[PDB]
């Protein structure tokens, strides 16, 4: 996701968090942003292009390979240079084995809890935007250039952004609050309120990331390079059929989020 996609995930993870992750990710937290979790989820981001923190480059995806539709941890959770576990599957089992360190403080200073927080939470929201496990060779539709409109941007950038924007423009005013607001009620008392014990019951963290992942690929085969061509463009049609799956993955990713966090630090 880019900033908003994040943001949202993050406001609604903190918003259903006990009472010890509530504590926790506080202390975490540096005073200037006032125990706001989002506003830091986006830092992974940023620091993805220095130098020092080239190695989070690939933990923010996974490249399944071309038209196979699944996703499979040893063939797939590697880089460029085979070198096992570095994807955001991985990040996310990693991440979350440093925050059990947190509470028994038994790890001296090899970690850093805070970040360790914030590339969690952020690759919590990254797993289930069903274009960060998409096909190799056309980079999660980084390279599948289309228009968007009445301008041109590419089929992962529509699904990092372009939905949300266009979301937000059209029906709150631009206003991102308030497209959060309609999607913490969907699940709430809404179309997915019968679904959130199905969405928290994944099992371990290792499985459970196995299951956000495949769940990633097959919308991501299923709606996000279905019905796209490149240099075409992308109409209401695409936008109004795809608005609830974009939706629907923020919030997964946030309940999600808000599991594991009450889980590693309860
Ligand atoms: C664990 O990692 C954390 C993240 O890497 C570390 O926290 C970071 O610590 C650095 C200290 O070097 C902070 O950067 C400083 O920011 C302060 C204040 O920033 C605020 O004010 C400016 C302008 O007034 C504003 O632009 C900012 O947005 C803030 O509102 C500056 O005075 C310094 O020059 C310096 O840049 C980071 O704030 C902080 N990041 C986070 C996410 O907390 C932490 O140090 C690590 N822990 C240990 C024990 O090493
Ligand atoms: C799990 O989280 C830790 C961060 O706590 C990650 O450790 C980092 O691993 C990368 C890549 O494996 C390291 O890069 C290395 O740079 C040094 C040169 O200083 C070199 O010895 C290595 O060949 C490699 O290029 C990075 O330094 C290391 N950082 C820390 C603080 O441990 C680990 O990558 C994470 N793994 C996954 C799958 O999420
Ligand atoms: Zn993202
Ligand atoms: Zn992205
Ligand atoms: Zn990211």
Redesign the pocket.
């Given at each position: 996701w880019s900033k908003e996609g994040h943001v949202m995930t993050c406001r609604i993870a903190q918003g259903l968090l006990n009472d010890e992750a509530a504590h926790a990710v506080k202390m975490l937290?540096?005073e200037?942003?006032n125990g706001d979790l989002s506003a830091?989820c986006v830092?992974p981001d940023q620091?993805r292009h220095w130098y020092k923190y080239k190695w989070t480059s690939p933990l923010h995806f996974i490249d399944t390979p071309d038209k196979a539709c699944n996703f499979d941890y040893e063939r797939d959770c590697h880089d460029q240079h085979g070198v096992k576990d570095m994807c955001v599957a991985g990040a996310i089992q990693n991440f979350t084995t440093q925050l059990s360190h947190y509470r028994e403080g038994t790890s001296d200073?090899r970690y850093?809890?805070?970040?360790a927080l914030?590339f969690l939470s952020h690759f919590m929201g990254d797993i289930h935007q069903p274009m960060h496990v998409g096909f190799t060779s056309d980079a999660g539709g980084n390279s599948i250039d289309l228009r968007w409109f009445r301008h041109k941007s590419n089929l992962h950038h529509v699904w990092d952004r372009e939905i949300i924007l266009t979301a937000a423009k059209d029906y709150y005013a631009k206003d991102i609050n308030l497209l959060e607001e309609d999607i913490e009620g969907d699940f709430t008392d809404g179309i997915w309120s019968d679904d959130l014990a199905s969405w928290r019951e994944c099992g371990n963290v290792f499985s459970c990331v196995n299951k956000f992942a495949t769940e990633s690929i097959n919308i991501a085969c299923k709606w996000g390079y279905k019905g796209v061509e490149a240099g075409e463009t992308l109409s209401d049609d695409y936008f109004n059929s795809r608005l609830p799956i974009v939706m629907k993955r923020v919030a997964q990713g946030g309940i999600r989020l808000a599991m594991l966090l009450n889980n590693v630090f309860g």
């Open positions: 937290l540096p200037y942003v830091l830092w620091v200073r850093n809890m805070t970040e914030l």
